[PDB]
Design an enzyme around this catalytic site. Structure first.
Site, PDB file in Angstrom:
ATOM      1  N   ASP A 227       2.648  -1.570   0.182  1.00  0.00           N
ATOM      2  CA  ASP A 227       1.736  -1.796  -0.867  1.00  0.00           C
ATOM      3  C   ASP A 227       2.249  -1.012  -2.032  1.00  0.00           C
ATOM      4  O   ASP A 227       3.371  -0.331  -2.135  1.00  0.00           O
ATOM      5  CB  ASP A 227       1.174  -0.355  -0.411  1.00  0.00           C
ATOM      6  CG  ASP A 227      -0.167   0.180  -1.461  1.00  0.00           C
ATOM      7  OD1 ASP A 227      -0.008  -0.513  -2.649  1.00  0.00           O
ATOM      8  OD2 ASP A 227      -0.732   0.460  -0.864  1.00  0.00           O
TER       9      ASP A 227
ATOM     10  N   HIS B 261      -9.411  -0.725  -2.242  1.00  0.00           N
ATOM     11  CA  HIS B 261      -7.836  -0.095  -2.640  1.00  0.00           C
ATOM     12  C   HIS B 261      -7.083  -1.863  -2.093  1.00  0.00           C
ATOM     13  O   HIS B 261      -8.119  -1.776  -0.754  1.00  0.00           O
ATOM     14  CB  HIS B 261      -7.314   0.641  -2.226  1.00  0.00           C
ATOM     15  CG  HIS B 261      -5.865   0.400  -2.538  1.00  0.00           C
ATOM     16  ND1 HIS B 261      -4.914  -0.113  -3.584  1.00  0.00           N
ATOM     17  CD2 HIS B 261      -4.370   1.511  -1.928  1.00  0.00           C
ATOM     18  CE1 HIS B 261      -3.782  -0.194  -2.981  1.00  0.00           C
ATOM     19  NE2 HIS B 261      -3.393   0.538  -2.429  1.00  0.00           N
TER      20      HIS B 261
ATOM     21  N   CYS C 186      -4.758  -3.061  -8.460  1.00  0.00           N
ATOM     22  CA  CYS C 186      -4.445  -3.043  -6.981  1.00  0.00           C
ATOM     23  C   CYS C 186      -4.519  -3.906  -6.087  1.00  0.00           C
ATOM     24  O   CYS C 186      -3.048  -4.778  -5.859  1.00  0.00           O
ATOM     25  CB  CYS C 186      -4.662  -2.287  -5.868  1.00  0.00           C
ATOM     26  SG  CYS C 186      -6.994  -2.259  -5.677  1.00  0.00           S
TER      27      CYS C 186
END
Ligand code: BR
Ligand code: BR
Ligand code: BR
Ligand code: BR
Ligand code: CA
Ligand code: CL
Ligand code: CL
Ligand code: CL
Ligand code: CL
Length: 675
Positions: free
Chosen positions: A353, A330, A272
């Protein structure tokens, strides 16, 4: 003869400077929409009242006038709307012209041509090409950002900071966005010509490139290998053979370049923060103010009900069924732009994202979702609101599962643990700006449970012992892991307490790697008595299964004769032995400055296959890879290398030291470069 263009002066330096695009390494004419730029046209003769010049700009494989991907405009004496050319002066043969694009023009590569009307005839001629970007400086541009310091940070800054770690110890890793580095801007523009949208329909894709919403969303899909079309291949397994350990990267620069160089083949491997870092670079290069966001105890609610489940067995072992549904942390991004589709209330920071976690409209994309919206539970708005909301507000539910009896039972519920210390780098420093108050109302408040009820409704139409695991020693790779389990009866009596404990190496997201320690004990404490059970895991015991995450899950399932089991949990982080960077003289532009990389091997055994990876925009050109000789036990390694600054100001030198025993050890050094 008839009027003709003899030559053209684009005044690149002047215009790029006024357009705030003079930082890109490229020699091309980089411009921003809705803003004037000046050119000098040297004609073969003087201009006549009878003649006329018409400019032609166009972009994409199907330049269309009615799609804004193509425009034809008259060299006028006054400015018009949309595209326009204004004759400001005509000194003999040379013509001073001011051109302007509409604030809503598609961003991308354009071509410019001139159609000259003269003496009953007509002729055309290509003038050149230029890049048109979003204008965060233009008040009427959706990506407008009024504050100077803010805009400088979220658009012009190429040195970043990303927070990582756990809710126990927030750390940070430096990141080289390097949007101004060689070929970077270009590659990022290439991304848009490689999207599923563009293959489906090129014409409509290019026309939609005048919208930060569309461009944002597309990028969140293209930064990942998924959907057989993208840049970074994710990997959270702990095994990265065939590629690179996600934790070793230091920037978006060598990642994007490798992408191209490899013929658009997936770069391996990323996690991530790598997606967010690379996405940020793409966003900032195109002109979309963006920043990296890190959320601690981030939940991945597979099913919309704002609730994630984690399991354990009576022996204290964490089970796989939901052991990676709540990431220690994250990372994602935020784009700054208005939401014409949502309203005036939902403009501002937008969640993007690029981490392939949840399928959206069948594809691995995510965002843009209004942050202000997420804070209000207005989860029915676009895009992917339900997912992102649960990501910060979901209830955590623990469960005990017996493999043998097959039975399953609820242990405890917690709605404050998920979504904690949401961080982002501060404007002008490496400080940590906490923006939790932006995503949700203070936990334990009316608005909290209200918004949470509103959300869930819109989406889904007595102990006796207290447990606490605690670090007791400097946790570090190479050193033994010393912990102490604390227990204390609260009731008035002497209870018998059985404790089943285990220790597992994991990846930050929760993926279980392997058991490195386990043990059981029984102890009876008197009323209010406080016990201390020591937990000791040796290096030999964990080094084998410890991954670059340097994380270990420690669990303790305690139980009393006639009560409910008390699950005591705690994830720990072991520090890597230190890696140091030192500048050996004053740093100045175009002046070589010698630097030293220092490392000391704390192990009883030597470390082999040592490699030093250094980079940093403005300090070095690309990445510098250096093979380091095998370093014996308790020995020190000193490597010297010269770097040549190109831009002045505060620059960021980042380093990575990797050896068989220590994958990805980071180092960072702020260097002040004199003019
Ligand atoms: Br896929
Ligand atoms: Br994976
Ligand atoms: Br820790
Ligand atoms: Br260099
Ligand atoms: Ca993809
Ligand atoms: Cl301006
Ligand atoms: Cl470029
Ligand atoms: Cl903010
Ligand atoms: Cl720094």
């Amino acid at each position: 003869a008839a009027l003709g263009v003899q030559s053209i002066n684009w005044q690149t330096a002047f215009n790029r400077q006024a357009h705030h695009t003079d930082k890109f390494s490229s020699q091309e004419l980089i411009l921003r929409r809705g803003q004037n730029f000046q050119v000098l046209m040297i004609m073969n003769k003087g201009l006549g009242s009878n003649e006329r010049l018409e400019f032609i700009v166009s972009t994409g494989p199907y330049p269309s006038e009615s799609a804004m991907t193509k425009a034809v405009f008259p060299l006028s004496n006054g400015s018009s709307g949309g595209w326009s050319a204004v004759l400001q002066a005509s000194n003999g043969n040379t013509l001073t012209i001011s051109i302007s694009s509409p604030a809503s023009a598609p961003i991308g590569r354009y071509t410019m041509a001139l159609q000259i009307f003269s003496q009953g005839g007509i002729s055309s001629v290509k003038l050149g090409t230029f890049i048109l970007l979003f204008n965060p400086w233009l008040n009427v541009d959706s990506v407008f950002m009024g504050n100077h310091a803010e805009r400088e940070e979220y658009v012009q800054e190429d040195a970043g900071i990303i927070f990582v770690g756990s809710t126990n110890r927030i750390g940070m890793i430096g990141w080289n966005f390097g949007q101004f580095e060689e070929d970077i801007l270009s590659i990022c523009l290439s991304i848009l010509d490689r999207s599923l949208n563009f293959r489906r329909d090129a014409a409509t894709d290019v026309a939609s490139r005048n919208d930060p919403k569309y461009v944002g969303r597309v990028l969140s899909a293209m930064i990942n290998s998924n959907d057989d079309n993208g840049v970074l291949a994710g990997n959270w397994s702990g095994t990265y053979t065939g590629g690179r350990d996600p934790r070793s990267w230091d920037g978006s620069v060598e990642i994007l370049k490798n992408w191209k160089k490899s013929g658009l083949s997936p770069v391996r491997y990323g996690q991530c923060w790598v997606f967010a870092g690379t996405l940020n670079t793409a966003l900032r290069s195109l002109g979309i103010p963006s920043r990296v966001i890190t959320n601690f105890n981030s939940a991945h609610d597979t099913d919309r009900n704002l609730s994630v489940d984690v399991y354990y067995d009576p022996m204290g072992n964490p089970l796989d069924k939901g052991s990676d549904s709540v990431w220690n942390f994250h990372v994602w991004n935020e784009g700054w732009f208005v939401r014409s589709d949502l309203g005036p209330s939902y403009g501002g920071w937008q969640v993007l994202d690029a981490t392939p976690q949840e399928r959206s409209q069948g594809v691995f994309q995510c965002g843009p979702a209004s942050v202000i919206g997420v804070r209000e539970g207005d989860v029915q708005l676009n895009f992917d609101m339900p997912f992102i909301f649960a990501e910060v507000n979901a209830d955590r539910i623990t469960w005990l599962y017996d493999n043998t009896t097959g039975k399953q039972w609820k242990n405890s519920v917690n709605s404050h643990t998920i979504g904690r210390y949401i961080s982002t780098k501060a404007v002008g420093s490496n400080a940590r700006m906490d923006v939790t108050d932006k995503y949700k109302y203070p936990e334990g408040s009316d608005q909290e449970r209200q918004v949470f009820q509103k959300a869930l409704g819109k989406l889904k139409p007595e102990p006796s012992i207290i447990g606490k695991l605690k670090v007791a020693g400097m946790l570090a790779v190479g050193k033994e892991v010393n912990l102490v389990l604390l227990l204390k009866n609260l009731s008035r009596d002497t209870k018998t307490v059985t404790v089943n404990m285990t220790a597992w190496t994991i990846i930050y997201n929760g993926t279980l790697v392997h058991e490195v320690w386990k043990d059981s004990a029984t102890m009876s404490l008197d009323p209010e008595e406080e016990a201390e059970h020591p937990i000791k895991i040796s290096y030999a015991q964990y080094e084998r299964y410890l991954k670059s995450d340097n994380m270990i899950r420690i669990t303790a399932v305690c139980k009393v004769p006639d009560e409910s089991e008390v699950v005591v949990e705690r994830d720990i982080i072991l520090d890597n032995p230190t890696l140091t960077l030192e500048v050996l003289n004053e740093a100045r532009v175009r002046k070589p400055v010698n630097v030293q990389m220092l490392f000391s091997n704390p192990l009883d055994e030597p470390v082999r296959d040592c490699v030093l990876m250094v980079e940093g925009s403005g300090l070095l050109l690309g990445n510098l890879k250096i093979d380091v000789p095998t370093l014996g036990p308790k020995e020190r390694s000193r490597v010297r290398f010269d770097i040549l600054p190109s831009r002045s100001g505060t620059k960021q030198l980042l380093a990575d030291f990797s050896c068989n025993k220590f994958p990805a050890i980071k180092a960072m050094l702020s260097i002040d470069v004199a003019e």
